[PDB]
Ligand binder design. Structure first.
Ligand SMILES: C=C(O[C@@H]1CC(C(=O)O)=C[C@@H](OP(=O)(O)O)[C@H]1O)C(=O)O
Length: 424
């Protein structure tokens, strides 16, 4: 496959970028629309939905369970029932949200639904969630992919303790269907280290928008009351995590990038993002329903806790590599990233060091010393965020090529075009 040459920015980037819908939100909207339809409440529509490999894997998963998902552009309509056919098999691909959000949903069906995935997907944690489902009265064959959920059209529900240290999606996946369990559900995360708090809060918030009663007033504990899931119209926000790759362009080039339709109040961690940009002395302003960032003329090393926003680590590692010569940066809170798409700490370390950089993995992150970089081939490891991180680096390093820029289709199929239009 041909490499993709990352275009350089010998001068301040200046652009207005529209990024498409949020993956996290879109795939939550699809699961909740599914539950409503399967409850008999009717069809739901998702407006401004992300169309990408991860959301296509989700609706296909949903269509495999018996539901009907229509729409050619960003408007998706969900209808039908959970009624899987014989030999039903969900392809989880590399979408963690399918792997983690759909086995609870399939338990409401009445047939064995098999879950399978990419060889790379088979490295992703899932065993805790499967054990949870067993505790909650579901027959599940297998402890990893491929596994079978043997549904008897009913999930007892109740109370369960889970160690979700490896992935917040184990809590989110349980919470999304719990309204449909007879007894509803009480989930207790045991121990500590619960990554990605904003994404469990995103689940809680969208549940409440669907009229589900969820109690999260005590940390590490969630209580959902059995009840109707409303059929409604869902309005999808631009993906703020993808927005940051584009905004990083303003930051490393000292230029100016605006993201259109940035939400003033949002179910995504916008505050965490903006605060991290301002750490690098970027100037961030809200203007005409769009977000504008002005990068500084230079910046030094930073320490940044990413525990709550781990999926920013590749773009922020790229920023750390492009800091003033000699700058030392520390990214922390992100031990759980060894369990992602790919182990992102090893991968980022490998690729940055290949460009002559200095990136050291630590027990919970990366320490990165900015040193001059050289041309090279930046490998994506089939990971959309790794691909975009190489793009950020090539803005400031001539001769950088990403092996597989198509990895970006996971959440942003149009990245090459978008990125080319922003840098030109
Ligand atoms: C891994 C990615 O996104 C994830 C989207 C996600 C979800 O709830 O939507 C939850 C978080 O999961 P975890 O607790 O396993 O880190 C994300 O990090 C990514 O896109 O890079």
């Amino acid at each position: 496959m041909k490499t993709w040459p990352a275009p350089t920015a010998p001068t301040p980037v200046r652009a207005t970028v529209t990024v498409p819908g949020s993956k996290s939100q879109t795939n939550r909207a699809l699961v909740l629309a599914a539950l409503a339809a399967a409850q008999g409440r009717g069809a739901s529509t998702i407006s401004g939905a992300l169309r990408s490999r991860d959301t296509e894997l989700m609706l296909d998963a949903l269509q495999t369970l018996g539901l009907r998902v229509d729409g050619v552009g960003s408007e998706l309509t969900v209808s039908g029932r959970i009624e899987p056919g014989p030999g039903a098999r969900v392809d989880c691909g590399l979408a963690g949200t399918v792997l983690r959000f759909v086995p609870p949903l399939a338990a409401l069906g009445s047939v064995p639904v098999t879950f399978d995935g990419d060889q790379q997907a088979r490295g992703r944690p899932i065993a805790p969630l499967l054990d949870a489902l067993r505790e909650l009265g579901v027959a599940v064959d297998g402890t990893g992919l491929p596994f079978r959920v043997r549904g008897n059209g009913s999930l007892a529900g109740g109370t369960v303790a889970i160690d979700a240290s490896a992935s917040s999606q184990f809590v989110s996946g349980l919470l999304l269907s719990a309204a449909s369990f007879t007894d509803g559900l009480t989930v207790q995360h045991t121990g500590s280290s619960l990554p990605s708090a904003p994404h469990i809060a995103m689940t809680a918030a969208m549940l409440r928008q669907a009229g589900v009663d969820i109690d999260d007033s005590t940390p590490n504990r969630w209580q959902v009351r059995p009840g109707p899931v409303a059929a409604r119209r869902w309005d999808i926000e631009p993906d703020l995590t993808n927005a940051v790759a584009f905004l990083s362009a303003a930051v490393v080039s000292g230029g100016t990038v605006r993201i259109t339709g940035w939400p003033r109040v949002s179910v995504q961690p916008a505050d965490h993002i903006l605060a991290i940009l301002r750490q690098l002395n970027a100037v961030v302003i809200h203007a005409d329903s769009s977000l504008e960032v002005r990068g500084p003329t230079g910046y030094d090393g930073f320490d940044v806790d990413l525990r709550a926003v781990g999926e920013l680590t590749p773009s922020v590692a790229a920023l750390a590599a492009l800091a003033s010569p000699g700058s030392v940066s520390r990214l922390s809170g992100i031990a759980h990233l060894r369990g992602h798409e790919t182990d992102r700490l090893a991968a980022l370390s490998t690729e940055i060091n290949r460009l002559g950089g200095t990136c050291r993995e630590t027990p919970d992150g990366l320490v990165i010393t900015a040193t001059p970089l050289r041309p090279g081939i930046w490998r994506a490891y089939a990971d959309h965020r790794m691909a975009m991180a190489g793009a950020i680096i090539g803005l400031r390093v001539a001769g950088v090529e990403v092996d597989d820029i198509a990895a970006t289709t996971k959440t942003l199929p149009e990245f090459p075009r978008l990125w080319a239009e922003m840098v030109g």
